[PDB]
Design a protein around this ligand. Structure first.
Ligand SMILES: Nc1ncnc2c1ncn2[C@@H]1O[C@H](COP(=O)(O)CP(=O)(O)O)[C@@H](O)[C@H]1O
Ligand SMILES: [Mg+2]
Ligand SMILES: [Mg+2]
Length: 233
């Protein structure tokens, strides 16, 4: 009835998909974890680079679990995904992302493993730090994840486990964290730790520095690790 030979982009733009709801919950850190985070954030240490060793060791542990979970559920053998770690610096956004294809975490694993439960060593570790211990000993005390806050002002964890949906955990410290269903880019099984780096900690975006600290502290991962470098324009 109204003849057309050619339409403008705005006229043929497709209608949006329906808006999704994401459920968000807010939790307090367990008291001694909150105290540890404030000690880590606000104290000078000379050897902050050990954060990456701690995150890589968490990913290697999650990857080891795929191998062993196949003994009680062989269907994991029929994933085609490679077991590996990727390190992804973004200079534009000032972020360093550690990506693995390990087992991932469920919603309740994020709440119970990343802030609301007390590790038995936390008070002894804070006393060892008062007495002048090197921050490197953190791993031995059961609280290595929080070493992220040596270099990051905010941390976001995106994760997907075979038994749950995809979730995002986030904290800028200050005593609480959030967990919220994540209906964005599906990441497939595994975990992605996004460090939003402090302004004076941008060395950890540079390829030589990252290679230096992987060779110094993370030579027995047991899985391939690759470093993605954005081409300089
Ligand atoms: N990349 C990852 N994949 C799966 N789970 C992870 C993870 N990073 C941290 N976690 C979970 O977070 C817990 C706490 O990590 P920490 O390094 O603080 C203590 P540890 O369990 O390694 O001795 C881990 O036990 C694990 O359940
Ligand atoms: Mg650990
Ligand atoms: Mg190992």
């Amino acid at each position: 009835l109204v003849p057309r030979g050619s339409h403008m982009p705005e006229e043929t733009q497709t209608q949006d998909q329906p808006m999704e709801e994401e459920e968000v919950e807010t939790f307090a850190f367990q008291a001694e974890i909150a105290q540890l985070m404030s000690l880590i954030i606000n104290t000078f240490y000379s050897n902050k680079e050990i954060f990456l060793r701690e995150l890589i060791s968490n990913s290697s542990d999650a990857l080891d679990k795929i191998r062993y979970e196949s003994l009680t559920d062989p269907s994991k053998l029929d994933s085609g995904k490679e077991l590996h770690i990727n390190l992804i610096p973004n200079k534009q956004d000032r972020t360093l992302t550690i990506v693995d294809t390990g087992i991932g975490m469920t919603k309740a694993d994020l709440i119970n493993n990343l802030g609301t439960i007390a590790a038995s060593g936390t008070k002894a570790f804070m006393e060892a730090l008062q007495a002048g211990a090197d921050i490197s000993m953190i791993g031995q005390f059961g609280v290595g994840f929080y070493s992220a806050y040596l270099v990051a002002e905010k941390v976001t964890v995106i994760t997907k486990h075979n038994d749950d949906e995809q979730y995002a955990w986030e904290s800028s410290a200050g005593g609480s964290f959030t967990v919220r269903t994540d209906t964005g880019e599906p990441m497939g099984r595994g975990t992605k730790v996004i460090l939003h780096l402090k302004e004076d900690q941008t060395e950890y975006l540079e390829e030589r520095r990252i290679k230096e600290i992987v060779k110094k502290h993370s030579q027995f991962i047991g899985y391939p690790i690759t470093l993605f470098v954005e081409k300089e324009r």
